[PDB]
Structures are given as structure tokens and as C-alpha cells.
Amino acid sequence: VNSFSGYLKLTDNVYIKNADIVEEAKKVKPTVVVNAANVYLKHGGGVAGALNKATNNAMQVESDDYIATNGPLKVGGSCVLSGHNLAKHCLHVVGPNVNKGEDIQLLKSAYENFNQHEVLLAPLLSAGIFGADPIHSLRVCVDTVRTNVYLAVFDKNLYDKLVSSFL
Ligand SMILES: Cc1nnc2n1C[C@@H](C(=O)O)N(C(=O)c1ccc(NC(=O)NC3CC3)cc1)C2
């Protein structure tokens, strides 16, 4: 028994709720929150900008030091950094950005990073401003992640479509 309240059960290990991931993190303070990162950890908009604003830019400050030492991530890759005021840890995961010409097949590799953590609060990778279809992202998530994932979907109409079309 963990602290996630109001999630609807989709599979043995995947749960879904209509809420902003940033607001879910502030309330729950999970062990791991997943950020929809880019390879530069430049958190300007979307999930990344939203979570970073909630950290008063401390996420960006930590991220810039990480990149200065280690260089960019790979598309499909991840790193673990502080969760600041939102979580114990933030798992920054880079899904392909199809609006930028990146390969959608890399979405499975991105979700595989979740398997290194027993429980995660997460958004739909590669969706939103990354350009992939949310329905597809949920399918890859369910078919790739084996650990316990709590998906927070901000958009009510998208949430309803994801639940109603789920196979
Ligand atoms: C439509 C559509 N198609 N795909 C998606 N969306 C909307 C949204 C969702 O979950 O429904 N998605 C995101 O990536 C996202 C989710 C949450 C956030 N938080 C956010 O801005 N907080 C504001 C500042 C307080 C930003 C971006 C995926």
C-alpha cells in the first residue's frame, strides 16, 4: 500500500488519473517523479518547464551542472537527479520528439528506464509537445514497464479517450 489516491486500474502494474503531474507530485511527494526531458535537460515548457517552475528553477540549476559535467543524454536514455520539493528523485527520461524528426521506435527504450524503479509517478512519454500519439504512448508503456507506474494525464478529454480506447 502506497500513497497514490484516486488512480484507476488499467493492468496489473499500470494506473491512471486525470490530474496535472506537477500537482500530483506536490501532494504525494513520491519516491520517483518522471520528467519528460530533452537530451540537454533544458526545462523550458511542457512537463519539464512545469515541474521546473514548481521547483523555483532549482531543477534547471542542478541539470545545467549535470550537463556541464556529463554532456547530453541519449534519446531513449535517462538520468536520476534530485526530486527537489516534488519527490525524493526525478528520473529525467528522453522520449523521441517526432516534431524534431526523432525515431518513434525509441519510445520503448525510453520506457525501459522505468523498470529500474519499483514505483513511479509519470507522464505520457513522447506525447504532448513531443508529437507522438498519446494512445500509442500508453500502449508502449503497458507493454514495456513491469514496475508500478502511476500515470497522471492533465487533459480530461485525453484521459477519457485513453481509458475508453484502452485494449
Ligand atoms: C493534449 C495532450 N496531448 N498529449 C498530452 N497532452 C496534454 C498533457 C496531458 O497529460 O494531458 N500532456 C503533457 O505532456 C503535459 C502534462 C502536464 C503538463 N503540466 C502543465 O503544463 N502544468 C501547468 C503549469 C501548471 C504539461 C504538459 C500530454
Side-chain angles (χ1 to χ4, degrees):
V1 179
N2 62 45
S3 171
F4 292 103
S5 140
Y7 284 76
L8 175 146
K9 189 170 182 59
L10 294 177
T11 69
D12 177 55
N13 64 301
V14 181
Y15 296 80
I16 195 167
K17 183 178 179 175
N18 182 195
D20 181 3
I21 184 172
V22 184
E23 293 305 316
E24 284 291 302
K26 282 196 284 184
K27 165 180 104 63
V28 172
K29 293 277 257 79
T31 306
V32 180
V33 66
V34 173
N35 181 33
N38 58 54
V39 297
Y40 307 111
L41 303 178
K42 282 184 36 145
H43 313 306
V47 168
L51 287 169
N52 176 59
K53 174 175 184 206
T55 76
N56 184 43
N57 211 52
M59 179 181 282
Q60 189 64 67
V61 169
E62 179 195 29
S63 292
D64 289 345
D65 171 271
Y66 173 92
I67 297 286
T69 300
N70 299 107
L73 297 182
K74 299 169 180 178
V75 180
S78 70
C79 66
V80 179
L81 290 175
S82 182
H84 301 278
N85 52 318
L86 300 179
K88 187 173 202 312
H89 304 109
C90 179
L91 179 71
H92 295 272
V93 180
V94 185
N97 186 322
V98 319
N99 297 328
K100 278 196 215 167
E102 299 170 352
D103 163 32
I104 193 58
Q105 293 304 130
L106 292 166
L107 186 53
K108 187 170 184 77
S109 299
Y111 275 116
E112 287 171 342
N113 295 286
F114 288 26
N115 289 322
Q116 301 293 319
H117 303 277
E118 286 193 9
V119 181
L120 316 88
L121 171 61
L124 280 176
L125 295 180
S126 292
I129 76 185
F130 281 56
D133 174 6
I135 295 181
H136 177 63
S137 180
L138 174 58
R139 186 74 260 164
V140 179
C141 180
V142 155
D143 294 341
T144 302
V145 181
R146 300 178 297 285
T147 55
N148 296 141
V149 54
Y150 289 81
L151 293 168
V153 178
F154 184 109
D155 193 291
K156 170 81 249 231
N157 296 135
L158 177 57
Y159 173 85
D160 289 345
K161 178 192 194 114
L162 287 165
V163 169
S164 300
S165 64
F166 184 69
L167 223 198

